[PDB]
């Protein structure tokens, strides 16, 4: 029969076959189920889609047509849950959030 | 000279489906690849630990779902579980 990608079967953009191969060759368990690569591909695709959409919104606010590490850092740091997920992560060339303490401001 | 095998073409497809008009730079591309790899290792390691704790030998969508619940915060976990369950249900019907 004609070949059908598991990504096409699950309606995903991320490679179910590559995720399965990485789970098998990564020494995680003795066996890997059929739906585990599908679930992992779906979760990864959702996460990257959310981050990319927030970064694109930040880039549009900055009047730019390209997403850069600064926009990724802004998107991640301006979200409570994304900051909790990526608290101990350094983003190269991402800078910091603009924030000055209130007592430092002049009267 | 040997198939560096990044996630760039998949992340670009996701980008073109969420924001059709904006591009991405190489540095942001590498950062997104690093993010995908990191989250993959986190979820896979947590699932492996769950399977070891429960004396199993296979990683299943139940293990992946429990790892997702343990590692993602708040509504992130809920929406990721919804997406994964939807994808698995769609794949089961082939």
């Amino acid at each position: 029969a004609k070949a059908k990608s598991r990504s096409s079967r699950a309606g995903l953009q991320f490679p179910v076959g590559r995720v399965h191969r990485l789970l098998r060759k990564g020494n995680y368990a003795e066996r890997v189920g059929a739906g585990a690569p599908v679930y992992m591909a779906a979760v990864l695709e959702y996460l990257t889609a959310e981050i990319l959409e927030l970064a694109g919104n930040a880039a549009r606010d900055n009047k730019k047509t390209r997403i850069i590490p600064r926009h990724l850092q802004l998107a991640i740091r301006n979200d409570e849950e994304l900051n909790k997920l990526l608290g101990k992560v350094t983003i190269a060339q991402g800078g910091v959030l603009p924030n000055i303490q209130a007592v430092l401001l002049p009267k | 000279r040997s198939r560096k095998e990044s996630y760039s073409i998949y992340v670009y497809k996701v980008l073109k489906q969420v924001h059709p008009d904006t591009g991405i730079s190489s540095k942001a591309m590498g950062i997104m690849n690093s993010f995908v790899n990191d989250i993959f290792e986190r979820i896979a390691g947590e699932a492996s630990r769950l399977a070891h704790y429960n004396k199993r030998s296979t990683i299943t969508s139940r293990e992946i779902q429990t790892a997702v619940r343990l590692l993602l915060p708040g509504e992130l976990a809920k929406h990721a579980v919804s997406e994964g369950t939807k994808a698995v249900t769609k794949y089961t019907s082939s």
Epitope: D79, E81 | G74, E75, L76
Partner: single-chain antibody, 226 residues
Framework: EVQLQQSGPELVEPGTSVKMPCKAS????????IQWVKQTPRQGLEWIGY????????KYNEKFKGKATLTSDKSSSTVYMELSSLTSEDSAVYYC?????????????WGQGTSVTVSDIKMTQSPSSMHASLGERVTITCKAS??????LSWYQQKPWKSPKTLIY???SLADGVPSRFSGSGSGQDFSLTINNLESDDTATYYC?????????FGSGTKLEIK
């Protein structure tokens, strides 16, 4: 568990200012934005703006900037909206509702309402009013103006009560909503279907998009039962 307490009716003289609270409990206060909705019988539900307690960030509607100002009190878990220069066209019920920072999420929990009386994308709901029996099939359409990527929600409002969320992401059932209600569609065409009716299903059904910065509600659809 999640409750969004509000204040009572506020009789106010024209030209003054009024501030109302949105004390929240039962959830992590800083992880969810608090959106504010005004409802008048002339134009139905309308979106004012929101405040994100995590970083005190706000965003207001184009037509509501200056009129309304949003502040947060993290210590008391309370959010206020202040209305200045109260014009005669300001007598309405103001709803504060919770919404997560996730783009997929919608307004899931609302406040009972604060009746204040002073002494873009257009979403078109095709059926203005409908009648049906106690076991029939009904369908409501929410033809949109521009392309929204499945960012549509459905709400049910009983008379003189706060709206209740039924569908989010244009297909996903809300928390506790029975499988009778089912949404469908993406892009510009959306649909709400109620499978088998009851005497309780008598309410007004709204459709809200949150795909772009100004959130717009639907015209409304009053459903009659027998």
């Amino acid at each position: 568990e999640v409750q969004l307490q509000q204040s009572g009716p506020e009789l106010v003289e024209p030209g003054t200012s009024v501030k109302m609270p949105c004390k929240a409990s039962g959830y992590t206060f800083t992880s969810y934005t608090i959106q504010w909705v005004k409802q008048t019988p002339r134009q139905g539900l309308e979106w004012i703006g929101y405040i994100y307690p995590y970083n005190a960030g706000t965003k207001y509607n184009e037509k509501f900037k200056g009129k309304a100002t949003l502040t947060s009190d993290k210590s008391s878990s309370t959010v206020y909206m202040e209305l200045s220069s109260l014009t005669s066209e300001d007598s309405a019920v103001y709803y504060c509702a919770r919404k997560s920072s996730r783009l997929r999420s919608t307004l899931d929990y609302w406040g009972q309402g604060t009746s204040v009386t002073v002494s873009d994308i257009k979403m078109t709901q095709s059926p203005s009013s409908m009648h049906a029996s106690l076991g029939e099939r009904v369908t409501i359409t929410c033809k949109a103006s521009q392309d929204i990527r499945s960012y549509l929600s459905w709400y049910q409002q009983k008379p003189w009560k706060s709206p209740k969320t039924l569908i989010y992401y244009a297909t996903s059932l809300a928390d506790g909503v029975p499988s009778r209600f089912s949404g469908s569609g993406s892009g510009q065409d959306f649909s709400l279907t109620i499978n088998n009716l009851e005497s309780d299903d008598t309410a007004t059904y709204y459709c809200l998009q949150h795909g772009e910065s100004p959130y717009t509600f639907g015209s409304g659809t009053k459903l009659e039962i027998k």
